């Protein structure tokens, strides 16, 4: 059944709750972003109101074929009324179109649901600065102190320098980047840019990217693989077998592959710096795992919560085991005592 942490008290609202059939008493279904564990269950047959960002609305229409009359996009950073309740959508710093949702309850309670987010100090100067938030439904993906990672900026610098050096040394090298969802577009766009190439991809992926309102996108991507030296492939194919196979397909236009796998966290983060990363190599193929995250580090999450000073925290990630629940609740109390709220 629909879990309590997907329900907004005092409303008929649910968040990211599309796989339970009809939720008894739900008058509006919000969708934070277009990732499959969140939209799971939506289709052309859905006949309730869906509230979301413009970009998420483009993806629902074009990729899932949800009918237009049930899609209600809202602009960001704007006070809106939905079934008699004031809401605001804020940028979540996750994937394109991803939002956090502020609900202003008739009784005076204010609730923030983060969806999936990467906490940033820039959020401290949004509409969140303007009033008190009583309850926080929090993206706790990496809520443990072992989870450190570099800035997105540091990671992109590393990838750009690496790719540029490789291709300038060998003009017959191919660069490949893995993907399995929206998000992390900076990785492959920044590399294609330093190399003066467009990124080549399947028709399905090109369609997905054309929904995202990225400026000048027609200048940066293409379905013509042969004219491109940065290819995108399914993440599943980013391994030595899948890459040798792929290399055959290019007809001796290339003799070397340099491939990037943008992972979340991986335990080499507890030892190694970004400057010190190395690839796995077999033959003329090298694969780099780069820790490009679109979720908060432990320290980023801690800072955001200690700034906001909520009265109650409701985790939305890692809630399935008692040991994870109990560990998270321990960090929350530490944070509150350290900061004095
Ligand atoms: Ni997500």
Swiss-Prot record:
Q: List the disulfide bonds.
A: none
- Phenotypic consequence of residue 295 to A: Impaired nuclear focus formation, reduced interaction with PIAS and increased sensitivity to cisplatin
Expression induction per the record is: During mitosis. The mRNA encoding this protein contains an internal ribosome entry site (IRES) in its 5'-UTR. This 5'-UTR generally suppresses translation while specifically promoting expression during mitosis, when cap-dependent translation may be impaired.
Tissue spec: Expressed in brain, heart, kidney, liver, pancreas, placenta and skeletal muscle.
Write out the annotated subcellular location.
Nucleus
Q: Which domain of life is it from?
A: Eukaryota
User: What does the subunit section of this Swiss-Prot or TrEMBL entry state?
Assistant: Binds constitutively to TP53BP1. Binds CDC27, which is itself a component of the anaphase promoting complex (APC). Binds PIAS1.
Family membership noted in the UniProt record:
Belongs to the DNA repair metallo-beta-lactamase (DRMBL) family.
Q: What does this protein do?
A: May be required for DNA interstrand cross-link repair. Also required for checkpoint mediated cell cycle arrest in early prophase in response to mitotic spindle poisons. Possesses beta-lactamase activity, catalyzing the hydrolysis of penicillin G and nitrocefin. Exhibits no activity towards other beta-lactam antibiotic classes including cephalosporins (cefotaxime) and carbapenems (imipenem).
State the name under which the record lists this protein.
DNA cross-link repair 1A protein
Species: Homo sapiens
Lineage of the native species? Eukaryota, Metazoa, Chordata, Craniata, Vertebrata
